[PDB]
Amino acid sequence: HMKVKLDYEEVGACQKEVLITWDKKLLNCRAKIRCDMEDIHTLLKEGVPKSRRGEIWQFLALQYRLRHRLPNKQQPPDISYKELLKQLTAQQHAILVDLGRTFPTHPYFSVQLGPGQLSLFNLLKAYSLLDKEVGYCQGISFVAGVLLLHMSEEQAFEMLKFLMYDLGFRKQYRPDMMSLQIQMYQLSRLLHDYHRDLYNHLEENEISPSLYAAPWFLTLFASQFSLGFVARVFDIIFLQGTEVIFKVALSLLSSQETLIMECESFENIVEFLKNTLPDMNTSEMEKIITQVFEMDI
Residues 6+ apart with CB under 8 A from 97: none
Enter the CATH code of domain 73-165: 1.10.8.270
Cα–Cα distance for residue pair 80/157, rounded to 1 Å: 10
Q: How many CB atoms lie within 10 A of CB 191?
A: 23
Euclidean distance between CA atoms 101 and 137, whole angstroms: 13
The percent of the chain in helix, strand and coil, each rounded to the nearest 5, is 55, 0, 45
Q: Is the dihedral of CA 211, 216, 218, 222 positive or negative?
A: positive
What does the alpha-carbon distance between residue 205 and residue 265 come to, in Å, rounded to a whole number?
7
| CATH 1.10.10.2750-classified regions of the chain | 1-72
Comparing CA positions, the residue from 203, 294, 183 lying closest to residue 195 is 203
List every span in the chain annotated with CATH 1.10.472.80: 166-297
Q: Where are the domain boundaries for CATH 1.10.8.270 in the chain?
A: 73-165
8 Å CB contact between 265 and 202:
no
We find that the CATH architecture of domain 166-297 is Orthogonal Bundle (1.10)
CB atoms within 10 A of CB 3: 8
Domain 1-72 has CATH 1.10.10.2750: yes
CA distance 271 to 265: 10
- Give the technique used to solve this structure: X-ray
Count how many residues are written for the chain. 297
Q: What is the resolution of this structure in A?
A: 3.5
Q: What is the DSSP string of 54-102?
A: HHHHHHHHHHHHHSS---SSSS-----HHHHHTSPPTTHHHHHHHHTTS
Contact 241, 167 (CB under 8 A): yes
